Amino acid sequence: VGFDSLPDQLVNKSVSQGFCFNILCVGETGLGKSTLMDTLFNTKFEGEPATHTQPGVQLQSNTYDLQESNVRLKLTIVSTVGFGDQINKEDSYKPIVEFIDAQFEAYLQEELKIRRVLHTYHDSRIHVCLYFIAPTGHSLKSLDLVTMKKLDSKVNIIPIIAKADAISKSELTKFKIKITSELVSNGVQIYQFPTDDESVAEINGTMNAHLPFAVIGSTEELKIGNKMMRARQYPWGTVQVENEAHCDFVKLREMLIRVNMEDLREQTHTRHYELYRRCKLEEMGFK
Amino acid sequence: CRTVPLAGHVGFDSLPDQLVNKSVSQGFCFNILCVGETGLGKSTLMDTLFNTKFEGEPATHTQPGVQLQSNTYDLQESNVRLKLTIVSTVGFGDQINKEDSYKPIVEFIDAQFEAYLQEELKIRRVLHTYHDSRIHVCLYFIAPTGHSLKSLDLVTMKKLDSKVNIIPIIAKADAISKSELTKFKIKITSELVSNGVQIYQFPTDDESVAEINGTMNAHLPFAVIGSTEELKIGNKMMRARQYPWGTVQVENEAHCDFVKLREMLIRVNMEDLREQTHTRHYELYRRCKLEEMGFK
Amino acid sequence: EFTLMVVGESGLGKSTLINSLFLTDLYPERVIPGAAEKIERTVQIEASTVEIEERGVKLRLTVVDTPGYGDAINCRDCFKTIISYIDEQFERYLHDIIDNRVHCCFYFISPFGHGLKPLDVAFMKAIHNKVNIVPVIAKADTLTLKERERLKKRILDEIEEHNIKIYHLPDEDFKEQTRLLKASIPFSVVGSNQLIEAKGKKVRGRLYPWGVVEVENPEHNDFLKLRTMLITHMQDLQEVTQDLHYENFRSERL
Amino acid sequence: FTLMVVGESGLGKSTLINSLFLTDLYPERVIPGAAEKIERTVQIEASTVEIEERGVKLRLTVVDTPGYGDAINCRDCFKTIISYIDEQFERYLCFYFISPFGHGLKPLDVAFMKAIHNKVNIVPVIAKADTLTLKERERLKKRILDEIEEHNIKIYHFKEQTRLLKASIPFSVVGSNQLIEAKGKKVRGRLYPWGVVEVENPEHNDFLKLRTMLITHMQDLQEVTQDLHYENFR
Amino acid sequence: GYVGFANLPNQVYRKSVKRGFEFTLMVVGESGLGKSTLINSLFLTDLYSPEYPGPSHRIKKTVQVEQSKVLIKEGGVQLLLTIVDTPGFGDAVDNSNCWQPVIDYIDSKFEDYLNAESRVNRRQMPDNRVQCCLYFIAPSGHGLKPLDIEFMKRLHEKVNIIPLIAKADTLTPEECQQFKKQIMKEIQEHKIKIYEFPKIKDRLPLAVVGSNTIIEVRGRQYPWGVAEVENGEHCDFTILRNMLIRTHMQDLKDVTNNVHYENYRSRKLAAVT
Amino acid sequence: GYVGFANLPNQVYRKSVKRGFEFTLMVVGESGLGKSTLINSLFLTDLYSPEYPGPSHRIKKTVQVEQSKVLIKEGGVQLLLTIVDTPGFGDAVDNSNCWQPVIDYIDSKFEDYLNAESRVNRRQMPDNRVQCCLYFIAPSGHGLKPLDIEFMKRLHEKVNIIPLIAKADTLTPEECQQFKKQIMKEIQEHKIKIYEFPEIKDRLPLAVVGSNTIIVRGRQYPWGVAEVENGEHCDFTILRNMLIRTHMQDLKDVTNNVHYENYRSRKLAA
């Protein structure tokens, strides 16, 4: 026919609708969630530091609207506050699993409506879940292993080690081994990058070998000459956020530089929006 | 004639070229009836009219009663074939008691009508491969007495006009004088008009031949001579007749109006004669008969 | 003294011939009827007296002709008046000086036909035993010579078969004249009293666009033969009427 | 003679003590299995260390506390330590480590300090000090001073060194088992991708200040434990 | 030619000319096939005009056959011509037995003519029986439409039908001859006998093009070329004119009143009581 | 100073290419209007070869909707195409309600796809719903046959109808323009809502001429050649662009958000 322009015919119409994304950052107060995320989007947001005297975990769910050359993204940032800071751990993941459930619920109950609209809807589902792990240095902590025990089947969880400038590299690798075995001790299949689309699969494959990442974030831009890049300052040195030997902020910014964002949406809608429906939606009909 | 006209010549004035060619391919049929006394010259008149001897041993004067010698021939001049039918009376006026003269003739004509009509009401009609025998013309001979019409001649003329188209002709015009022929003609035409005898009037409708018919209408009746005695008057011709005081010729307009008689066949009015038998005689017979026929 | 009969179909031209015999007109007012009423016309007796002494001494003869003979479509016994007339004349004369006592009877024959039309045979079979019948072919100017002789021979044959008693002429120039006269019977005549120019001058004769037929030429016809026969045999006709016909009538019913 | 080494099992107590006293107190010790530390019990072992300084004591034993933290839920979480200190104080008849991965005094600080500050004088110590910027250091120090002041917490109190010690109570410390080199100063360092952190630099931290305070006020600790807390004991 | 009875052709010529002439031609086909234009082009574009329009409007609700009378006096000969047109035939949604009003019209004409020539007082009243029938088969290609297949298996024994491939300017010659040969196959397979016009390239049916624009002067100017009706290599309009108008009207009347009127009366008068 | 939002369209494209593509095109029209030739010419010029005859043999005894699953490998893009065409329509002795099989097939495909993608255990399945129907019109020259008017006014809330002037190469520009005005006046005497391209009616509706023979693929007549590549009225490019190049994704979007959703709110209404 000579007209292979079918794939381009739907790209040009989605940008008219605009995009919508969501992000869940899970970690106890103090690990630098708001700071890391403000550095990730290179913007100053409305999240002020919280208090250790929060009796119950709450969800910020602060929404925004950014812009680029053509796209008009409608971000929806949700972050836990007052999590994992008291003597209670087996009842910590409840207010951060009911959230994803209730975000499934609205889209579901609009999908079954009679005069339903789907060309333009604001999908409020959580599309990814970063998981900050304290930089202890022996193995995964209790709350961490219990939370990834019963959360991996709902969102494409991604384990990253926060505040990773207090762990030596000569030790860090062992920590990785000493955590990854626990991953295969309980046998939790944390998000495996596709590694099937032969066009780009080897980047995902090597990303999975360093799957336990390490990150750091700060809204202070220190070293100059090269550019106004953000770093860390201490009386005995400076830490480069993207040096590829200090931290893997670039490697974590491969879901943001978008090696796979649409894959996250697809796996949310076909492997987490299905196990909530292939099994859990069997309350009424077809039994 | 304000109508809706054309522009280019459609290919239009060719109907009287298809109708003409359709009739030539199937030939014509014609029927002449010679009515007149025995010995007047009927057979010789036809012999010198169609330039060929046909038949005929003369009728004996001992014929008990008039019959009809009918004979159909297949003459053909060029590209045209005629089923000709000469119907000559035989013994007409032979006997003494001539009061019952015309009936054996007139019935004959009517009989022929039935033939054509017998194919009309019949449902297995085939009117395209059909050859009717209706008497188409009646040439009536008049003896040149010089006083008036003879009585039998008048009665047959008066009681045969409304069946077939009659032409009255003076036979044997070698007998009367032109000094007296004019008075004879005036008297006979006057008694024709007085006795209401309506001779065939040549048509005056069409304007191509209107006045030729108009002038020939006042010459009735014609004087004619017919013979086959082969006499050459200086050049190629035979139709003459000897006499001790001088030969008579036929194709001259001074002596006898022979050509004026042949102007019913040669050019003008004989297709019209056929049509006229078909339209005012046949229709009249249909009117007079389709009141006993029980058909409306 | 003498009386002559002429009979024939009306229109044959017999009045004109009998005028041309005596050079006179003797029917002053006669109206030839129209065709409309001569359909069933009758026959009368037209007897006219005229004085001629051309050859004899005094012959105030009368000519009798019958108008309207055979003219009607059906002859309603048209022989009645003529035969009655002859019988009446014989009885009147034999009452005895001669009143009429018709001596000769010309019968004109139409030349258009092929011979004796059966009415002619009827008449010459009815009368031939009463008067001197003379057959004369009227309007002889319409017969070619060959048809003339064929008609003559057929007239003779129809005489022979029906045994018609034609008046034969009783038997040196006299012998030759009688021979030619008896050979030429029946005669041929043409009558015309319109004096019309010819080769010589101022002669009797008819005119046609092709010719001028005369009368006294014995080659055109036999008119002069008829006249001379009549004139010469006046006496012989009287004698034959006296000695063969009147005697027969006296021998028969009286 | 009473002291404690209490922390969240990963602050760095083992290397800190081993470099403070030049010991190998646990030649054969294994980190509890990750799948096994769900109900992480708290246990106490013994010690045997001879101290060499200007003054030599008979012997020194530290109250090693494996498995104090890492609890799904602290049911008791406080029993064996108080039992051992009470028994050690009955035979006659304190470092608390604050993690730097927080806004300040996390919970379990007010409870523990309120429980034991009337039993033994407590020395607050911020472990893993090499991850706190000076502005954040001062901010958190002011915050913890306010928090201990707000809920009535008493901790502890030529003379230039005395003023310096009394002006920075929450000492910042690190621990370094293996000596590593940096810019010509190679004494018990820790290696990082940006070089080496040196334990004895007075500006990076106050480790040597803590060592001097402990090694010179041992008589002070002995007398306060034998005169003040002993009266409250009975 | 001395006896001169050979002057009969002259006599019949003169009588025919003096008498006058008449004709009646009927056209049927799906509305919009270019019939009115062809009729106008035949008798020089004066019958249908914005003063009186024919089947262009095509009121198809009730197919009432209409007839128009025109007088033409071209070469001294004047005939009265009857164009017979069918508004609404085949165009509507249903084409079930749609031919019935046409049969009604033709047979009513036959009946009135018979009543004319059966009375005692018969006369020279004008005859109206339609002489010729032109059918416009659409040039679909590769097959004959079933509607016209059943049309020409019914009426072909009543009136002389000459099938016409209307709008034949849209058929390539190879497909044109293939379509024509398939028409012959479906004619000599379904036992169809049609008017034989008493060859190889001019194989019946005939192709016609009807134009009214004065360009190139009847012709059409497409943005890719010209369509002309007079030339015989492109279409065959002149062939239809030759064997419809100039040559075979008399034969058409002969067959009408010798084989069709004859059969109608041999049916009726053999079924009468 | 960018975080990478621009890469989202790139991910969308790269993901859609791998998943493959499908299409289902309806062609409706009476026989002899060039449907088979047009459809063969449009797509790679390979379909309805004498190996597979198709509706070229116009079987008129019965009407049987015959789709044809075909596969096209456009370089590196898989297109599984079907040409839903009804052999025999609007040409037999009678044609009243002669469109029920078409609407039957359309509604059956809608219902079967709804069954496929509404169960609790649903998964990725083929898509067999028709996307657009091309309705051919013969060039009468006076208006629209009442069958076409009924087809429009009846079956227009269910499938994207595109009216085509079949065999536009037998018309004159003046009469063609008057034909267009007349049809879009009867379109407002009988209010009809054809699929209007997003934003002028003067150069509408689309008129198309199709062929297969090469000569420039054009037909040969005794007076020369009739072409397909132009822009006046034999517009074989405007259809091939505003049907495949530009608005085909919009065709799917309007079938789903309007037509398929109208059915989904009709069958689920009560």
Ligand SMILES: Nc1nc2c(ncn2[C@@H]2O[C@H](COP(=O)(O)OP(=O)(O)OP(=O)(O)O)[C@@H](O)[C@H]2O)c(=O)[nH]1
């Ligand atoms: N050493 C180090 N300190 C950090 C880092 N990120 C943030 N901080 C400091 O830690 C403090 C707390 O971080 P916040 O930005 O408030 O985010 P948070 O720790 O998750 O606390 P909340 O967002 O309020 O729940 C900040 O004020 C920073 O000064 C980091 O990556 N490394």
Ligand SMILES: Nc1nc2c(ncn2[C@@H]2O[C@H](COP(=O)(O)OP(=O)(O)OP(=O)(O)O)[C@@H](O)[C@H]2O)c(=O)[nH]1
């Ligand atoms: N006066 C005259 N005589 C003629 C004429 N033509 C022929 N004759 C002659 O008259 C005789 C009559 O001959 P036909 O004509 O054969 O006799 P017909 O008229 O046939 O009589 P039928 O046999 O009864 O019919 C012939 O012998 C001719 O010699 C003519 O025109 N005028």
Ligand SMILES: Nc1nc2c(ncn2[C@@H]2O[C@H](COP(=O)(O)OP(=O)(O)O)[C@@H](O)[C@H]2O)c(=O)[nH]1
């Ligand atoms: N050819 C010819 N015609 C004659 C002759 N005599 C008289 N006619 C014609 O006959 C007419 C008169 O005849 P007519 O003597 O009265 O005979 P009738 O009537 O029987 O008495 C005239 O008009 C003449 O034309 C003759 O000798 N020859």
Ligand SMILES: Nc1nc2c(ncn2[C@@H]2O[C@H](COP(=O)(O)OP(=O)(O)O)[C@@H](O)[C@H]2O)c(=O)[nH]1
């Ligand atoms: N940041 C930092 N890390 C240390 C220090 N000392 C030890 N570590 C690291 O902490 C890890 C575990 O220490 P660990 O012996 O379990 O400390 P403990 O849990 O308090 O007994 C070791 O692998 C060391 O690399 C220190 O002073 N600072």
Ligand SMILES: Nc1nc2c(ncn2[C@@H]2O[C@H](COP(=O)(O)OP(=O)(O)O)[C@@H](O)[C@H]2O)c(=O)[nH]1
């Ligand atoms: N291509 C072509 N078009 C034609 C032909 N004849 C007529 N037309 C078209 O048909 C239209 C007229 O149709 P018309 O005859 O009124 O249809 P009808 O009223 O149903 O008979 C005109 O606009 C012409 O363009 C032809 O021979 N070829």
Ligand SMILES: Nc1nc2c(ncn2[C@@H]2O[C@H](COP(=O)(O)OP(=O)(O)O)[C@@H](O)[C@H]2O)c(=O)[nH]1
């Ligand atoms: N009407 C028409 N017929 C054609 C065309 N091209 C070829 N044909 C002929 O039509 C036959 C096949 O007809 P088909 O393509 O099925 O006609 P369609 O159904 O209207 O597409 C072939 O034998 C060709 O000879 C065209 O463009 N139009």
Ligand SMILES: [Mg+2]
């Ligand atoms: Mg004869």
